[PDB]
Design a protein around this motif. Structure first.
Motif, PDB file in Angstrom:
ATOM      1  N   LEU A 227       0.844  -1.193   0.000  1.00 45.64           N
ATOM      2  CA  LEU A 227       0.000   0.000   0.000  1.00 45.64           C
ATOM      3  C   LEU A 227       0.878   1.240   0.000  1.00 45.64           C
ATOM      4  O   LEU A 227       1.867   1.290   0.747  1.00 45.64           O
ATOM      5  CB  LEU A 227      -0.926   0.039   1.213  1.00 45.64           C
ATOM      6  CG  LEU A 227      -2.094  -0.949   1.313  1.00 45.64           C
ATOM      7  CD1 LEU A 227      -2.900  -0.620   2.508  1.00 45.64           C
ATOM      8  CD2 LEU A 227      -2.993  -0.926   0.114  1.00 45.64           C
ATOM      9  N   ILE A 228       0.530   2.220  -0.861  1.00 49.79           N
ATOM     10  CA  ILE A 228       1.220   3.519  -0.921  1.00 49.79           C
ATOM     11  C   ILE A 228       0.472   4.507  -0.039  1.00 49.79           C
ATOM     12  O   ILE A 228       1.063   5.280   0.679  1.00 49.79           O
ATOM     13  CB  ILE A 228       1.345   4.048  -2.351  1.00 49.79           C
ATOM     14  CG1 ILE A 228       1.973   2.984  -3.272  1.00 49.79           C
ATOM     15  CG2 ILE A 228       2.159   5.341  -2.336  1.00 49.79           C
ATOM     16  CD1 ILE A 228       3.262   2.391  -2.802  1.00 49.79           C
ATOM     17  N   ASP A 229      -0.837   4.473  -0.112  1.00 49.34           N
ATOM     18  CA  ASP A 229      -1.682   5.039   0.916  1.00 49.34           C
ATOM     19  C   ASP A 229      -2.997   4.203   0.957  1.00 49.34           C
ATOM     20  O   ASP A 229      -3.050   3.101   0.418  1.00 49.34           O
ATOM     21  CB  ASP A 229      -1.904   6.535   0.672  1.00 49.34           C
ATOM     22  CG  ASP A 229      -2.914   6.834  -0.461  1.00 49.34           C
ATOM     23  OD1 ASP A 229      -3.218   8.032  -0.701  1.00 49.34           O
ATOM     24  OD2 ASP A 229      -3.410   5.885  -1.114  1.00 49.34           O
TER      25      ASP A 229
ATOM     26  N   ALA B 275       3.876  10.524  -2.027  1.00 52.22           N
ATOM     27  CA  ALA B 275       2.419  10.627  -1.795  1.00 52.22           C
ATOM     28  C   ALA B 275       2.064  11.533  -0.627  1.00 52.22           C
ATOM     29  O   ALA B 275       1.183  12.384  -0.742  1.00 52.22           O
ATOM     30  CB  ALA B 275       1.813   9.267  -1.587  1.00 52.22           C
ATOM     31  N   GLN B 276       2.766  11.366   0.489  1.00 51.45           N
ATOM     32  CA  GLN B 276       2.549  12.243   1.621  1.00 51.45           C
ATOM     33  C   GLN B 276       2.979  13.694   1.356  1.00 51.45           C
ATOM     34  O   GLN B 276       2.321  14.612   1.778  1.00 51.45           O
ATOM     35  CB  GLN B 276       3.179  11.682   2.898  1.00 51.45           C
ATOM     36  CG  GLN B 276       2.522  10.373   3.396  1.00 51.45           C
ATOM     37  CD  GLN B 276       0.948  10.405   3.465  1.00 51.45           C
ATOM     38  OE1 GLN B 276       0.320  11.466   3.606  1.00 51.45           O
ATOM     39  NE2 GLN B 276       0.332   9.230   3.357  1.00 51.45           N
ATOM     40  N   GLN B 277       4.052  13.933   0.635  1.00 51.83           N
ATOM     41  CA  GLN B 277       4.382  15.310   0.334  1.00 51.83           C
ATOM     42  C   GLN B 277       3.250  15.983  -0.379  1.00 51.83           C
ATOM     43  O   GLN B 277       2.943  17.128  -0.068  1.00 51.83           O
ATOM     44  CB  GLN B 277       5.668  15.423  -0.480  1.00 51.83           C
ATOM     45  CG  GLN B 277       6.887  15.501   0.385  1.00 51.83           C
ATOM     46  CD  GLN B 277       8.117  14.847  -0.207  1.00 51.83           C
ATOM     47  OE1 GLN B 277       8.143  14.459  -1.364  1.00 51.83           O
ATOM     48  NE2 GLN B 277       9.158  14.717   0.617  1.00 51.83           N
TER      49      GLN B 277
ATOM     50  N   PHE C 250       0.913   0.502 -10.467  1.00 53.09           N
ATOM     51  CA  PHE C 250       0.179   1.238  -9.463  1.00 53.09           C
ATOM     52  C   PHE C 250      -1.278   1.132  -9.787  1.00 53.09           C
ATOM     53  O   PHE C 250      -1.638   1.295 -10.931  1.00 53.09           O
ATOM     54  CB  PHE C 250       0.551   2.697  -9.499  1.00 53.09           C
ATOM     55  CG  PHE C 250       1.932   2.983  -9.038  1.00 53.09           C
ATOM     56  CD1 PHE C 250       2.188   3.256  -7.701  1.00 53.09           C
ATOM     57  CD2 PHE C 250       2.990   3.026  -9.945  1.00 53.09           C
ATOM     58  CE1 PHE C 250       3.479   3.565  -7.286  1.00 53.09           C
ATOM     59  CE2 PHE C 250       4.281   3.324  -9.535  1.00 53.09           C
ATOM     60  CZ  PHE C 250       4.535   3.596  -8.214  1.00 53.09           C
ATOM     61  N   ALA C 251      -2.110   0.872  -8.786  1.00 55.04           N
ATOM     62  CA  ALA C 251      -3.559   0.820  -8.964  1.00 55.04           C
ATOM     63  C   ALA C 251      -4.228   1.500  -7.793  1.00 55.04           C
ATOM     64  O   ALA C 251      -3.846   1.285  -6.654  1.00 55.04           O
ATOM     65  CB  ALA C 251      -4.058  -0.615  -9.074  1.00 55.04           C
ATOM     66  N   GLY C 252      -5.227   2.330  -8.073  1.00 51.12           N
ATOM     67  CA  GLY C 252      -5.937   3.033  -7.017  1.00 51.12           C
ATOM     68  C   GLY C 252      -7.136   3.798  -7.550  1.00 51.12           C
ATOM     69  O   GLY C 252      -7.429   3.719  -8.740  1.00 51.12           O
TER      70      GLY C 252
END
Lengths: 227, 203, 227, 227, 227, 227, 203, 203, 227
Positions: A63-65, A90-92, A132-134
């Motif tokens: 998980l990336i987020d 992602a957090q930035q 990447f999938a989301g």
């Protein structure tokens, strides 16, 4: 001759050292992603090196987020380093704008980091591909990304040794907007088509996300119902 | 200065006056304090003019670049969060400004932002030395159920009131109306004057 | 011998490594631009790698701002990096002066970044060509720009594999000040002349801008009427 | 052997890599400058690659300021970069002192930048020659400058492929203090002597400055009267 | 083998790459200096490449300040860069102490800059020799200095192609404390001895300084009286 | 093979490049130092390249301060640079502590600078040996130091081409605590033993210091009384 | 301190006095405040002596270097523009000085320069604590048509008046005359004294 | 100081006076406060003379360079936006100046710019200590329909009034007229004096 | 092949360049240390190159502080540099904590500096081994350390040419807790066993420390009583 430094073009305008990084990606386990009705899923195979290994550890689906996930193939240490860059990246973005409107941009940032290592001498490329999938504000997304920094958006795709098997199978079999359950079944079926018969598919990883929800990791029992 | 931003069902109305003063000295009667910074976003400025104008230019540049990169407009809340970060980063050597950002994404929004990065969303807000007088008119006369025409009149009144009692405020009133249908539309001067006349006002 | 470092001249005063970078450009899809009456347009072909790819994604024609666009050919990761340099460079100029008076200067800045990577050891050149087309205070503009950092202004030009086909066809067929519709038809016709018959032109990209307006990207249906 | 790095002397004390840079200069269009009565002029030929090119663009004669101009030959991207260094260098001098008393010093600054890139490893030289012509407080000036950073002041000179033709013709035919019109005619005549007969001289560029005036760029019609 | 990098000793303890730089010095025009009664002088030959060159320009004898001058031989661009270091170095010393008590120290600073480029990889040496002649608080001074950074003080010496001719002639003919006029005659005579008969000496440069005075550059007419 | 970089060990654990630097030292003029009763002295030969050279200049014996002197052999430009480091190093120590208690430490600092250039790539070693002789709070001191950064303290020693001649002669003839006059005679005699008979010893340099005094440089007349 | 610079047809005359005081305390009676800084250029200094002296040394160095590089003397206006930039660059940690730069290029010039890099050309100027007294003599007595002898007398007077009423000014008067013909010539002391005596003055 | 800039149909007129004072002390009667900085652009300065002069030099350099690079003149608004950025960037160590920038591109423009980068366009503006007096004359007498001759007289009057009541203002009036036809033309002194006489004024 | 850079592994996982550094250590004089009852001692041989050398100088046993000493073998200049690093490192620790609790940490710091030069390109390793012996709060300590940065604690050990001789002799003869006098005798005896008979042991260095005391250097007379 033209083969031996990331900064050298061949007379036909090729970067062989990058093409070679791309061969590292073929040595990984096969993974695939696909879009279905209001969502996207990932499924990954896994080398199980021994029975002395710990299963509930070093996961191929990361998980990336809460709304974005990645599978990777190729050199594992490179892949780890890139997944953590992806998370921090992602957090930035979330801190700057309060949210991640378009996943394509996260991917591009990761792809750019990779491209940069195909241009300045003194470094080698990352021998990694990622999917990447989301869900974002455009909708369900599915991207891949290779050592050269090349990006594409798909309805379905795959990476790893069995890539070519799995992509043919899907070129014939995939339809859009399947319900989740059928999508997962198509995926497992596709994955099997890449094995060498005799050889049988052990417990693989399955994550999925649908619009308005967070990601959902299937446990080994739920996964079993599809084997 | 006097600037105001209000929200309605499917619309944002933003208005300012135009006066620029070096102390008691009215240097310019038609400065600009209302800017479009995106397809469906407007910004009003109050405070040090140089700091305001720099920020107008950055927000235009950055919101345009963002849109090209994302293929969608920055959410209004995102515009506020960006400004919030920018301004806080330099809080000890700040942009001496008060901003309103207003626009339409999935809904209307107005955010009010201070020189420390404080950002807050509200159904309406005003800024500048005239703002208390505006907050008076609005407290007494604002309704959620107002139509865009009613709203335009309301803001003309609030700023007219401000102008009558704030010597730092004056000049022509500018109004913009931001809707999904027509985007950011800056009402023409002759239409604002007409309404000023019909409502029985001055300047 | 003289072939293997960007910093090395050949005895005839050549930079082969740069010439090689230029070959990379020949491996891209063909794209063209041309000026017509009060405007400029871009048309681009596209490799469609599969039917599992997502069409409405990774566009060959990219907006730099509302009045300037680019198409690129060559290494795609390099091209992506250069387009984003172009965009940030454009915004820097607008913040400094409030507008972009002369597009030639944006182009030069991008071209200078490219030239820089043909002079300092430790980097390779970008294997990319670009066409920039837009309206500025001089009028409608059309430029190209290669890995060497060389720049030219054209009435019409092209880049990619089919470049030579498309430039001949235009050397014979192009007139100035065509109406938009005829200019687009001449362009599609020119593009077809570079294909290898049997092979047929699928949906290409078309963007156009005229004086006093913003750019306008043709949708696939509008494009179809010309096929 | 001694041939392959800018930092290497040959046993006879030569820097071949710099001599090779000088060959790049021979591949450019021919241009020439000459002093005449109270002034100096420049004339430049031009490759016209196609009829699809835009004429009123990328000029071989470039103004450095109102009283100083340059023509260049060799690698075009290098030339562009050097002309902009020349312009920024000129403006620094004006800001420091209020004016440009002696053009020789602008030239030296440009020549020193060039020399620098013939001494430190990690860079190649600029494959460019320039002629600078202008008026300063000494009088009318005409300089040239090559990849090595070598500088000379002339009454007349040339650079480009046809250099040797043009310098012989002038060694025989040049006189000092001609009137402008005759000077320009001698120049066109000299330029023609470098073509290969059959081959005919299209519209070239012509700029001129006289004491107490600014530069003056001849338009294509005015130029035509001399063809 | 031991021939190809400034940082490599040969087994006999040699730096060939520096020795090679010393061959570049032999390709320059011959110049000489000599001490005479209360003074020192310089004389320099000059390649006159054409009649289209400007005589009153790029001088072989260069003033470093009012009481110190230099002549140089070798790569011209390197020599220019060194003379300007020499000038700036002189002024730094005058600003620090109010004057230049001993010219040997100026020369050493220049010689040290040169030595430095014979020790660190990534740079080649300056292919230059210089003679410095002036008056300081010790008296009239005459030094030379080569690509190695080696320094010597002379009563008379020379540099350039004709060096060996001129040094022999002076070994036989020089006496100390000549009057200025005889010193200049001996110099011209010595210079001629290095030409290849048939070949005749055109107008050379001549500068002189005597104790309590500033330098004095002979004009071409004054020079002519000695030819 | 193992011969060509300061950073490479031979399989026997040697640094040939440093050994080669040591050969540079053999090419210098012979100099020697020796301790005698309450003092130490230096004597140096000298190449006198011509009669056009200036004698009272570039001295082989150099004062580091009033109580410490050095003679050097090898590449002259390297030697100059090291003697100045030595001087600056001496003054730093005096400023820090008010005096130079033990000369060994000055020498070590110089020797460490030298060693440093035998370990980091990108530089070559100094091709120099030095002898340092002076009085400090321990007593009269005599050290040598070579390109490797090796240091020894002696009663007598030498450096230069005639080193081996001079050391043998001294191995046989030296006694401690001679009076100054006899010490100097022994030195001259030793120095002569290294010449090739026929060849005769011109005026050499002689400096000496005794406890409680400053250095004292013998003038050419005083030196003559020993020839 | 008192320094003065005047222009005439083809000449510049510059003069100063020599006193140096730490407050009311006369430390030195013969300091130097007039310097040649080029063949046809002179400079006078007032203000902090350390800042002045550093600048004198730079200008000498830089104008000598410039002349060798360009083969012509720096134009006087260029000298001023250089100083202007140097001083403005460090305005917030300034050279605490007032400078006069005077010289001949194609014509005579006198420039006056302040500690922020303000530079202005004038037919005459003066600086230091005595300057107001000088500006009085000059307003009343200066003529464009004056000869070099008349001008030398004038400045002697202006400074003698300044010395009589500024306790911070005193000592021998220095004069320099800058002409195309003879360059910068510093008049000898015995000549200045003779003129002081002939004009009937003191100190 | 007094400077003024006005716009008319197809013209810009800019004028200043020339006095330079260190406090109450009139150091120079003919300083220059009006400069051409491009073919059709002029600039007037007020404030610290060093900071002003540095900016004049930069604007000349940068607008010349820009023109050579773009092959067109910098739009007047662009010149303002450049200055705006330059000055705001150093607001906490500012150029202590007030600038007028005036010129012709597709239309006439006058911009007024402060030491924080505040820039505002107006039909007219004035700056310096004499500016209030000028704003008086203009408020009463300026007309859009004025001709270039009428405009030149107007500015001569505004400044003459400023000079009469601002002791920091004085000296000869400089005027420049900027038009598409003739570019930036600095009116000759004798013509300004003639109009001063004909209008019945002084200094 | 795998032999020629500190950063290269051989296919068997070796760093030959470091193994070669280790051969430099074999060329040194033999020294040994050993623990005895409440203490530790060092003994070192010494090349005495001549009778013109000064004995009471450049000592093979070097104090690091009052309670810690080192002997070294290998390249002398490298050894000097490492001993000074050792001394400065000791004092840093004492300033930070007020004392040196465990000598193993001093050693590790020195060992880490050495390891560092076996991993980054652009430096060669130090061709040195050291033995450190001292008292700390654990008790008497004896360590060695080599070019690789490898460390061991011993009861007795040796370094230098005669290492292998001395270690065998001690493997057979050493016992723990000998009194000092017997320990020293065993040491001298061991040392002699490494000589080649005929060859005889001149005056060696001997230092010792016992718990609760400071180090104690034996003078040449005291040493003589054991020869």
């Amino acid at each position: 001759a033209y083969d031996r430094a990331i900064t050298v073009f061949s007379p036909d305008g090729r970067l062989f050292q990058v093409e070679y990084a791309r061969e590292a990606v073929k040595k990984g386990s096969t993974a695939l992603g696909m879009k279905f009705a209001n969502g996207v899923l990932l499924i990954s195979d896994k080398k199980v090196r021994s029975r002395l290994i710990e299963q509930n550890s070093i996961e191929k689906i990361q998980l990336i987020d809460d709304y974005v996930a990645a599978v990777t193939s190729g050199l594992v240490a490179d892949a780890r380093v890139l997944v953590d860059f992806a998370r921090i990246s992602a957090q930035q973005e979330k801190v700057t704008y309060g949210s991640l409107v378009n996943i394509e941009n996260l991917v591009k940032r990761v792809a750019d980091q990779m491209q940069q290592y195909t241009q300045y001498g003194g470094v080698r490329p990352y021998g990694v591909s990622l999917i990447f999938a989301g869900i974002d504000q455009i909708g369900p997304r599915l991207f891949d990304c290779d050592p050269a920094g090349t990006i594409n958006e798909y309805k379905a795709t795959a990476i790893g040794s069995g890539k070519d098997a799995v992509v043919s199978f899907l070129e014939r079999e995939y339809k859009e907007n399947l319900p989740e359950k059928e999508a997962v079944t198509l995926g497992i079926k596709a994955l099997k088509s890449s094995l060498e018969e005799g050889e049988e598919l052990k417990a693989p990883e399955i994550a999925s996300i649908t619009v308005g929800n967070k990601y959902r990791i299937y446990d080994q029992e739920e996964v079993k119902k599809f084997l | 200065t006097t600037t105001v931003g209000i929200t309605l069902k499917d619309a944002v109305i933003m208005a300012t006056e135009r006066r620029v003063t070096m102390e008691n000295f009215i240097m310019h009667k038609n400065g600009k304090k209302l800017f479009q910074i995106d397809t469906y976003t407007g910004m009003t400025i109050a405070g040090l003019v140089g700091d305001a104008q720099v920020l107008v230019r950055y927000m235009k540049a950055e919101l345009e670049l963002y849109r090209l990169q994302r293929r969608v407009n920055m959410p209004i809340e995102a515009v506020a969060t960006l400004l919030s970060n920018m301004l806080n980063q330099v809080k000890y050597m700040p942009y001496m400004v008060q901003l309103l950002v207003g626009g339409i994404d999935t809904a209307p929004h107005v955010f009010s932002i201070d020189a420390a990065g404080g950002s807050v969303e509200d159904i309406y807000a005003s800024t500048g030395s005239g703002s208390p007088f505006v907050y008076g008119v609005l407290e007494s006369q604002y309704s959620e159920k107002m139509t865009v025409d009613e709203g335009v009149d309301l803001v003309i009144r609030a700023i007219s009131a401000a102008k009558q009692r704030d010597s730092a405020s004056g000049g022509m009133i500018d109004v913009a109306v931001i809707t999904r249908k027509d985007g950011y539309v800056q009402l023409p001067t002759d239409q604002i004057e007409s309404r000023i006349r019909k409502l029985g006002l001055i300047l």
